[PDB]
Design an enzyme around this catalytic site. Sequence first.
Site, PDB file in Angstrom:
ATOM      1  N   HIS A  96      -4.840   3.452   1.652  1.00 18.82           N
ATOM      2  CA  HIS A  96      -3.428   3.410   1.290  1.00 18.82           C
ATOM      3  C   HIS A  96      -2.670   4.203   2.332  1.00 18.82           C
ATOM      4  O   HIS A  96      -2.879   5.408   2.459  1.00 18.82           O
ATOM      5  CB  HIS A  96      -3.165   4.041  -0.077  1.00 18.82           C
ATOM      6  CG  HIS A  96      -4.057   3.541  -1.163  1.00 18.82           C
ATOM      7  ND1 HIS A  96      -3.993   2.255  -1.652  1.00 18.82           N
ATOM      8  CD2 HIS A  96      -5.022   4.168  -1.879  1.00 18.82           C
ATOM      9  CE1 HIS A  96      -4.890   2.103  -2.613  1.00 18.82           C
ATOM     10  NE2 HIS A  96      -5.527   3.252  -2.774  1.00 18.82           N
ATOM     11  N   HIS A  97      -1.788   3.545   3.060  1.00 22.57           N
ATOM     12  CA  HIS A  97      -1.033   4.150   4.149  1.00 22.57           C
ATOM     13  C   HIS A  97       0.404   4.323   3.672  1.00 22.57           C
ATOM     14  O   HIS A  97       1.118   3.334   3.484  1.00 22.57           O
ATOM     15  CB  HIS A  97      -1.116   3.258   5.388  1.00 22.57           C
ATOM     16  CG  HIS A  97      -0.195   3.650   6.498  1.00 22.57           C
ATOM     17  ND1 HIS A  97      -0.301   4.841   7.181  1.00 22.57           N
ATOM     18  CD2 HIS A  97       0.828   2.973   7.076  1.00 22.57           C
ATOM     19  CE1 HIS A  97       0.637   4.896   8.114  1.00 22.57           C
ATOM     20  NE2 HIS A  97       1.322   3.765   8.082  1.00 22.57           N
TER      21      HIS A  97
END
Lengths: 148, 148
Positions: free
Chosen positions: B82-83
């Site tokens: 998850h960026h």
Amino acid sequence: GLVGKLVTQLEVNCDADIFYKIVKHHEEVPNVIPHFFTGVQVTKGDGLVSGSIKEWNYVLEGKAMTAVEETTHADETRTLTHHITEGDAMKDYKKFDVIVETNPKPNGSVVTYSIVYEKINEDSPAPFDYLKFFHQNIVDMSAHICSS
Amino acid sequence: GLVGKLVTQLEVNCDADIFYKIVKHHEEVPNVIPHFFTGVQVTKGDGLVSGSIKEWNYVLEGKAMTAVEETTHADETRTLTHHITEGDAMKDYKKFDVIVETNPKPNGSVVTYSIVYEKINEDSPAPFDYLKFFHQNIVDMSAHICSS
């Protein structure tokens, strides 16, 4: 849920071997935090100190606590280990060990504090309070070190 | 102090590939915690979904917050990423990425949640609030899974 590990890893602008020697010989608790210890040093046979067994009295998040811990080191791998055998943490954990490693960046150094734990039961918390405490203590130590 | 990584690692009594598929397709936030998202799915070219871009609205330690995050996965290594590009966390961090890995125990599985972060400045906290949140969320998910 029962067996786990918490880690805080930090980059420091210091040679890994030098920084390890600083961590090895410095009290991991700043003076502003209430704490003291009594205990003994451990030797390996040639008479040189190889570790310690300490009873700590300290205040964590406002609560006074005690811990008995045996510290050992491995210079070759720049690793310090604190093995807790007794005290407040043992009301929550069957096992509680703190491992501090320092390594050169693949590029300064990377310092890793790991808390390896086993809970007594599912109602026990994971040791986030200890992780933050060790983190802030190593940040405080590193803030008082500079180049040259 | 500025660049670091926080990790929570947990043992789960589940096959690693099966558990990865459960984590991949489950909302990482229980319904009791206030949250929702809007956004889109991302495809790779053959028309199949490979990820998502979501704007989350959530309450963390009582405070309502927002995050924009792009999720990707690597089935071969059982890794979800998850960026985070925008939102409340970006007031404290230049970079904030959450990496979830599942691997078989060298002996069930080991699940690792890592928060890789870079602070805006030294006054920024390290993301212990997020680490505890992700930890409790994965413990809650795992508590609703059992054998057979």
